[PDB]
């Protein structure tokens, strides 16, 4: 079966682990729940293709990073700095992959919140400038979580 190596990156506490554990185990990380594990493997069927997903939940990180085939770049919609950090995460990925054209989706997480400081349009516009999809997610409600990871798999297949 086909394999996909996915890497989840982003600033602290944006929800990298929550998104990954929600996709892998269908439960929501809260305050004091374990996010010590950094790697996850899951067999899933995606558009009729049985897929083996390796997911690296980032906190020898560079050797792991270089092997990623696609990247979820995550910020939280109530964390302006995490959104401003995205450009640096993308630049790092581009350098370690040695490519201007890496499968990537921009994820705006925590879209369940009743107040936000990062507007959807400005994330939409940044993603357009990168040529990549933008998906708003909630690891809490599961909204868009499968959409984000599967869209990333589809971007890797398009590559
Ligand atoms: N309301 C809400 N809170 C969320 C959501 N996703 C994560 N959180 C909360 O945000 C905090 C950090 O989540 P976590 O997944 O650990 O983030 P992280 O990016 O893995 N942090 P770290 O860099 O420490 O690995 C936790 O309190 C978690 O419950 C979400 O979609 N909605
Ligand atoms: Ca293999
Ligand atoms: Mg984490």
UniProtKB/Swiss-Prot annotation:
InterPro entries per record: P-loop_NTPase, Small_GTP-bd, Small_GTPase, Small_GTPase_Ras-type
SMART domains in UniProt: RAB, RAS, RHO
Recorded GO CC terms: ciliary basal body; cytoplasm; cytosol; endoplasmic reticulum membrane; glutamatergic synapse; Golgi apparatus; Golgi membrane; GTPase complex
Free-text activity regulation comment from the record: Alternates between an inactive form bound to GDP and an active form bound to GTP. Activated by a guanine nucleotide-exchange factor (GEF) and inactivated by a GTPase-activating protein (GAP).
UniProt key word Glycoprotein: yes
Residue numbers carrying N-acetylthreonine: 2
Protein name: GTPase HRas
S-nitrosocysteine sites (modified residues): 111
Phenotypic consequence of residue 37 to G: No effect on interaction with PLCE1
Predominant cellular place of this UniProt entry's protein: membrane
Keywords: Acetylation, Cell membrane, Cytoplasm, Disease variant, Glycoprotein, Golgi apparatus, GTP-binding, Hydrolase, Isopeptide bond, Lipoprotein, Membrane, Methylation, Nucleotide-binding, Nucleus, Palmitate, Prenylation, Proto-oncogene, S-nitrosylation, Ubl conjugation
Effect of residue 137 to I: GTP-binding activity reduced by factor of 25
Free-text description of this protein's post-translational modifications in UniProt: Palmitoylated by the ZDHHC9-GOLGA7 complex. A continuous cycle of de- and re-palmitoylation regulates rapid exchange between plasma membrane and Golgi. S-nitrosylated; critical for redox regulation. Important for stimulating guanine nucleotide exchange. No structural perturbation on nitrosylation.
The keyword Cytoplasm is annotated on this UniProt entry: yes
Enzyme Commission number: 3.6.5.2
Effect of residue 34 to G: No effect on interaction with PLCE1
GO biological process entries: adipose tissue development; animal organ morphogenesis; cell surface receptor signaling pathway; cellular response to gamma radiation; cellular senescence; chemotaxis; defense response to protozoan; endocytosis
Natural source organism: Homo sapiens (Human)
Homology family: Belongs to the small GTPase superfamily. Ras family.
Motif (Effector region): 32-40
A GO term for molecular function: G protein activity
Connected disease: Costello syndrome: A rare condition characterized by prenatally increased growth, postnatal growth deficiency, intellectual disability, distinctive facial appearance, cardiovascular abnormalities (typically pulmonic stenosis, hypertrophic cardiomyopathy and/or atrial tachycardia), tumor predisposition, skin and musculoskeletal abnormalities.
Impact upon substituting residue 38 to N: No effect on interaction with PLCE1
């Amino acid at each position: 079966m086909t394999e996909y190596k996915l890497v989840v990156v982003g600033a602290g506490d944006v929800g990298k682990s929550a998104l990954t554990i929600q996709l892998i185990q269908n439960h929501f990380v809260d305050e004091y729940d374990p996010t010590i594990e950094d790697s996850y493997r899951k067999q899933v069927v995606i558009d009729g293709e049985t897929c083996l997903l390796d997911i690296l939940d980032t906190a020898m990180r560079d050797q792991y990073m270089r092997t990623g085939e696609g990247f979820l770049c995550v910020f939280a919609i109530n964390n302006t700095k995490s959104f401003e950090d995205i450009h640096q995460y993308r630049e790092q990925i581009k350098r370690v992959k040695d490519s201007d054209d890496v499968p990537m989706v921009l994820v705006g997480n925590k879209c369940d919140l009743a107040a936000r400081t990062v507007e959807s349009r400005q994330a939409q516009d940044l993603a357009r400038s990168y040529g990549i999809p933008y998906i708003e997610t909630s690891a809490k409600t599961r909204q868009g979580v499968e959409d984000a990871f599967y869209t990333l798999v589809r971007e890797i297949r398009q590559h």
